[PDB]
């Protein structure tokens, strides 16, 4: 009546068509298989925390965080430097303010520590 066509530039030079969608899925699965073949008994990814999303819109939702904290790791009963060797992602810049999020993470860490089998250095 509206329409805006951004074809005033030399658009025909930069046209990326993703024919390799099927090729790149295979490539990532081969990558995962290789990583799991090198990291044999371990999962494939670090233990990630539970986290509340920002903004009025999404604060209903609970999502994965980057890492726990020095606080959540200490309350679980271990050190940050040792947590990384057991494959627990640690976030130094994140803060602890909500009690429900805190306790959920501590129990996630505690249940993780019961389920694991750490190999000796010998």
């Amino acid at each position: 009546p509206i329409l805006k066509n951004h074809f005033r530039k030399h658009w025909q030079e930069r046209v990326k068509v993703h024919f390799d969608q099927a090729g790149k899925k295979v490539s990532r699965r081969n990558a995962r298989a290789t990583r799991a073949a090198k990291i044999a008994p371990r999962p494939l990814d670090l233990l990630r925390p539970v986290v509340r999303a920002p903004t009025v819109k999404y604060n209903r939702k609970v999502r994965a965080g980057r890492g726990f904290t020095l606080a959540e790791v200490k309350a679980a009963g271990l050190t940050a430097a040792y947590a990384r060797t057991i494959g627990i992602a640690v976030d130094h810049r994140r803060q602890n303010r909500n009690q429900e999020i805190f306790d959920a993470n501590v129990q996630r860490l505690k249940e993780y520590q019961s389920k694991i089998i750490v190999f000796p250095r010998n």
Binding site: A33, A40, P41, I117, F119
Partner: protein, 130 residues
């Protein structure tokens, strides 16, 4: 092309590498218990659930004791120097157990060490001896 045209024409020979079948099937290396029990006909995640071990700690996008006992089996299963020993010999023979006097001695406790350091090191000396 320009260079490829010559290389497909020359008597040098191509450096042909047939490394395509090796891209899919990479042998498991880091653990011999897993190396013996890994069905290569199955995938990565299928070989994890077959053994029991959790492959991804976050819940995946999409739709999804035989060996772990053997692991559990193999997982349930600092001396002193000549000069340090002879130093503790001197301290015990001159004092005995009076750690206050033992650490206030300038002649034998040349490094002005505490009482706790002395009783710990002497008990290491006493366990290795009679």
């Amino acid at each position: 092309s320009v260079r490829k045209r010559k290389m497909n024409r020359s008597s040098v020979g191509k450096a042909t590498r047939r490394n395509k079948d090796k891209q899919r099937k990479i042998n498991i290396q880091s653990n011999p218990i897993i190396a013996a029990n890994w069905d290569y006909s199955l995938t990565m995640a299928q070989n994890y659930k077959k053994l029991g071990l959790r492959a991804k700690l976050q819940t995946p996008a999409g739709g999804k004791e035989t060996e772990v006992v053997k692991k559990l089996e193999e997982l349930a299963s600092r001396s002193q120097s000549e000069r340090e020993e002879e130093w503790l010999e001197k301290l015990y023979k001159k004092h005995g157990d009076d750690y206050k006097k033992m650490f206030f001695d300038k002649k034998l406790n040349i490094y002005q060490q505490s009482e706790g350091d002395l009783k710990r090191r002497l008990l290491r000396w006493k366990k290795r001896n009679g």
